[PDB]
Amino acid sequence: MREVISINVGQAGCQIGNACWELYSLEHGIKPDGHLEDGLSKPKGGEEGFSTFFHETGYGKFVPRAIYVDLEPNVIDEVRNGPYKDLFHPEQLISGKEDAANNYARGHYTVGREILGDVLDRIRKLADQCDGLQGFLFTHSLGGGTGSGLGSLLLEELSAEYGKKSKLEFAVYPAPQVSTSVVEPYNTVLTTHTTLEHADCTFMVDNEAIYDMCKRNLDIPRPSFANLNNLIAQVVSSVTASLRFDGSLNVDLNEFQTNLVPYPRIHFPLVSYSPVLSKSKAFHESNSVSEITNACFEPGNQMVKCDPRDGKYMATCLLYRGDVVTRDVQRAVEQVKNKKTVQLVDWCPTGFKIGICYEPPTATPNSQLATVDRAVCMLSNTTSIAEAWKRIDRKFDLMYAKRAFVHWYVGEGMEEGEFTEAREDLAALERDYIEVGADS
Amino acid sequence: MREIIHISTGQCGNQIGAAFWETICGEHGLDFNGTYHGHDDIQKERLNVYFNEASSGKWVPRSINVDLEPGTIDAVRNSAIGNLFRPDNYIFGQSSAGNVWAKGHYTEGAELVDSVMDVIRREAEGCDSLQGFQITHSLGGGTGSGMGTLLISKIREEFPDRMMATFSVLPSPKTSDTVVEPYNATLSVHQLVEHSDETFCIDNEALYDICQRTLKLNQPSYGDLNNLVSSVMSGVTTSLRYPGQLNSDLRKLAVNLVPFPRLHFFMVGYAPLTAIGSQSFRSLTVPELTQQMFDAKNMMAAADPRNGRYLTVAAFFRGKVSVKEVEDEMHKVQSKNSDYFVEWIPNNVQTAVCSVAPQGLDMAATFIANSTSIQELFKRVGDQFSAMFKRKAFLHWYTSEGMDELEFSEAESNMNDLVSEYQQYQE
Amino acid sequence: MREIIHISTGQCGNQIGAAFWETICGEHGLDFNGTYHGHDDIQKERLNVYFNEASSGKWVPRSINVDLEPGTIDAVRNSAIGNLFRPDNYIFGQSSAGNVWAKGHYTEGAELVDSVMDVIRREAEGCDSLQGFQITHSLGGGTGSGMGTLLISKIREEFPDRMMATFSVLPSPKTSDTVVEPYNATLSVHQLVEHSDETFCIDNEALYDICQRTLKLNQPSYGDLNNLVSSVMSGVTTSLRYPGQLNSDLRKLAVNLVPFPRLHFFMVGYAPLTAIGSQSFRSLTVPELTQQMFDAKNMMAAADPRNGRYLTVAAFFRGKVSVKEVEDEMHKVQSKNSDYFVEWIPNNVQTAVCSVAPQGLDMAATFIANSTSIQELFKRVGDQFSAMFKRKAFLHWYTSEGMDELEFSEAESNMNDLVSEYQQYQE
């Protein structure tokens, strides 16, 4: 109950991982090659953590404990020819050599599970290497079939092997406006059932919203995927805020599923990060936490193309970094309640989890986010993505009228029954989304 | 799983393959005397796809060129870069296929093709990551249509898990070099549809039109047309051999672009279509390439796109491009061109990103799509048969070897079935 | 126990032995005037196998060449390197054996062979570590088949503990230089099977085929064929005269390759089979040599290997080679070629490693195996007898000296027994 293992699947997941370990090296003072250069704190390991994500080598080196699994060797080569070679163990970089699809056509079938044995053996050896195990971090793209298929397969495998560890999945969802490839909705929904049956906490991120805030908040005319990776890297690394730094009231990973999820039911909270400003707008804004919370409530900063204020209230967590005052945040949340926001349920009935962290918020030099003395990361399991899955499901109905793909899907061994079961599972999930707020 | 073996056959196929070879050796950089010019790493592991390491640091192609006339190889080894070709790659015989289908592969074309199959096998165990098979031939040509289909038959027989890529040149229904050119074309497509997974529609008259429109070419030369088609052929695989946001593979084309293996006909479009004298006056950007993509006079099918409708379209972009430009332009085209897209996908789009810039240019792309305009060409050819071939004039030259009217009736039924498939899927 | 005495007889045998001599003197290095050129030590103690130290630091061969025509030695002492041959080595008479078997050794061939046996004895006490006996002759030739078998008889009589190696050239069943060439061949093998421990199948037509396939030789010359067979002959003993992972000896061939002394017929294969103009385009590696080994057009039996099956195969590798490459390729061939191996060994393999590289090449090997394809040649020769010799035409030339039909019937029974042995051991 000490270490967290992170696995990235797909090119997008690998880029996100690269960005996030670059940050981790940045705040914790590890040079882009490690050992050291030099150690900083007190507390960064020792005392623990680290080790929480970086293995503490006996020689004094710091080694990230991650497994790069992919069937496209280009990403592994790009990782290995850069400064990342000194951070990842050679045996942890599982480079694939078979390319027949990208990738869900064969990824979620017999083609992938003769390699999964080696992956499970390696992760078991890594778990035996460390003392204890707390949870897993997942970073895969639901657009790319590699991420969907391989990540889902690992999900059922590691839910079977332990079944007692927290499962955090940062899945990149396809843009609801347009899809880069047609098969992405299949790659998402044919694994949504496995996610429902084999996940504990899933985080939804949309590239369209990140691009929107880059165009608007960052004033960037041509946003890049690297900027998105860096932004979601801060989002991930602020969660994950009190687990590596001292705080007055630290937040535990189990606490999330104790308070946000009181049922064997919906466990898919939203995330938001704020303030979001450029280096040129830092000379005019010194706002308090109330406006930061208001920015979090904005649809554009929710990483979902929907209105979070049109939904119904659900238990939420507020995490604070830097210089914050409890009276100020209590006043802010009381004002938010006074403004008659999303309809409060009668089961909590009003629960605002407040997290305070001493460390100042940090920003990436590769990104245009200005360093701020206080930041808010808000987690809420709001039912406002229900219309998002409804739009995806309408797309599903219209492209399932002809079924458009069942030729290959049946030819490899599947049949329309699985698609119908996924359809009715999604319908049941939407109905539960409506009912959980309709009961109150 | 990247290596590609380039098979060349036919009179036009040899020229197309040769021009593709010079375009490849110029785009990655390799002098003909065996001098390394890659810069720096990505141009070294990716040349294993087409070349194999010989002794003393020499790179030689893995490509079997076959033709019944041996005069083309003389204009290859002594001409521009073909000196890397090992002498064993020259499989040639005597003297011709007769420019017909009855003698192309039915009786005399099945003799040396056993040795061709043997050398394909030996290259197969000589290869480690065999990915796909590239063939360039002529639909109406006697040699290309003759043993090309039978080579496809063997490559399916020995490789049931490997897809096949065909780039036959479709003769125009208005130009008749010989009276039996459409006859050979249809006798070839009789088995092409039953043995191929995807194909491209190439018309020389469309190339002439685009040369006289944008290039303003004064001398009709097949070399420039070969250069254009070879640039397109390189562009469709730059995504595989150069990583981007979304790498694309031929199997990905089969999964996404192809609706089902029966329907695999594609029209090809290329951009930018600019000539000398206009390079200092245009801004080469993603939107301009897009209006050049959907322009009705830029594809080489060549048919009318705005009188029918598309079933699915794809974009294969190359060079330093931001993710926002391409998606924003795709929103624009889906908003303004929504009528001609099918109402069941409903977003006909497949995107691929390439890192390196095209040779001789800054930004470029290729266009692959499915429309209902190919059935018009099919019915034109069928009407040509129903008009000319009802007199049974010069038809004995094929029935002398044992041809029956059942095969021709079955081919007519096949083209009827293709039209019906093109109407399912209504125009 | 290394010294080898090379016996030469017959018209073709003299040329083969001479060419073997130039190949030997070039592979270890020795000029014809008596100049030391070994580098440095291993090339000095190993030349005692073929040469003996004369006065003033001179090395002379220990080889008895015998032939009834004295014109071949004139084209040896005055031609390329044969000047080291001591004058006593020239045992020649007058004038010919008649190109037949009745006069080869039955009546007139038994006169000077007593002196030959005496000089063999005197060389025997002149030798200290006599190991084996190499003989080169022609199966259908009058001289080689004539006194070759009788020399084998004496060498068995006087050396009951020394094995015998024979490399007779088997005439093809389709080429008939003379009407009685197969007749002499069978009259020789009548005692060859009863007096030899191992033999190699050599066919000149296979050499012509491999020359016209890979060498593209324009002039039919016996010198190049002699060079090839002499390189093979040197390669089969490089393992003995140069240490490796597993040194191989002729007795080791008898123990492992030979299933029993009755069956001792082997087909020979050599690699690499490359010519000038392809040296700068291939990678000479163990796997390529392996596909050249099991290739159906590379052995010189010459028969069809994939229509029958092997009983046991062997590999004799030369040059700087790692242990992993050869064993990995052997796993590959045993996995893909498992059907044609016998199901009772079950791993038909014998490996030998040589240190020094072959002359004129980098890496090379020899192929020795047992298959069921030699019984086809035997039945072809038997059918030729049963067709031509039932007329008793020109048959009196042999019965005039006291030949009986019992010997021919016994030879037919012997070839029937050989076929039955080749079917035990089913095809």
Numbering used by the authors:
A (entry chain E): 1 to 440
B (entry chain Q), C (entry chain Z): 1 to 427
Paper text:
Microtubule (MT) filaments, composed of α/β-tubulin dimers, are fundamental to cellular architecture, function and organismal development. They are nucleated from MT organizing centers by the evolutionarily conserved γ-tubulin ring complex (γTuRC). S. cerevisiae γTuRC is built from a helical repeat of seven ‘V’-shaped copies of the tetrameric γ-tubulin small complex (γTuSC), composed of Spc97/GCP2 (SPB component 97/γ-tubulin complex 2) and Spc98/GCP3 subunits each bound to a γ-tubulin molecule. Here we used cryo-electron tomography to determine the structure of the native γTuRC capping the minus end of a MT in the context of enriched budding yeast spindles.
We reconstructed the native yeast MT lattice to 6.6 Å resolution. Three-dimensional (3D) classification of the MT subtomogram volumes against 11–16 PF reference structures revealed that the native MT lattice contains almost exclusively 13 PFs (97%) consistent with γTuRC presenting 13 γ-tubulin molecules for MT nucleation. This is in contrast with yeast MTs nucleated in vitro using recombinant α/β-tubulin, where a highly variable PF number is observed, with 14 PFs being the most abundant, although in agreement with native yeast α/β-tubulin MTs nucleation in vitro. The MT lattice in our tomograms is densely decorated with MAPs that could not be resolved during consensus map refinement due to conformational heterogeneity. The native yeast MT lattice is in a partially compacted state compared to structures of yeast MT reconstituted in vitro, suggesting that the native nucleotide state as well as MAPs result in a well-defined MT lattice spacing in cells.
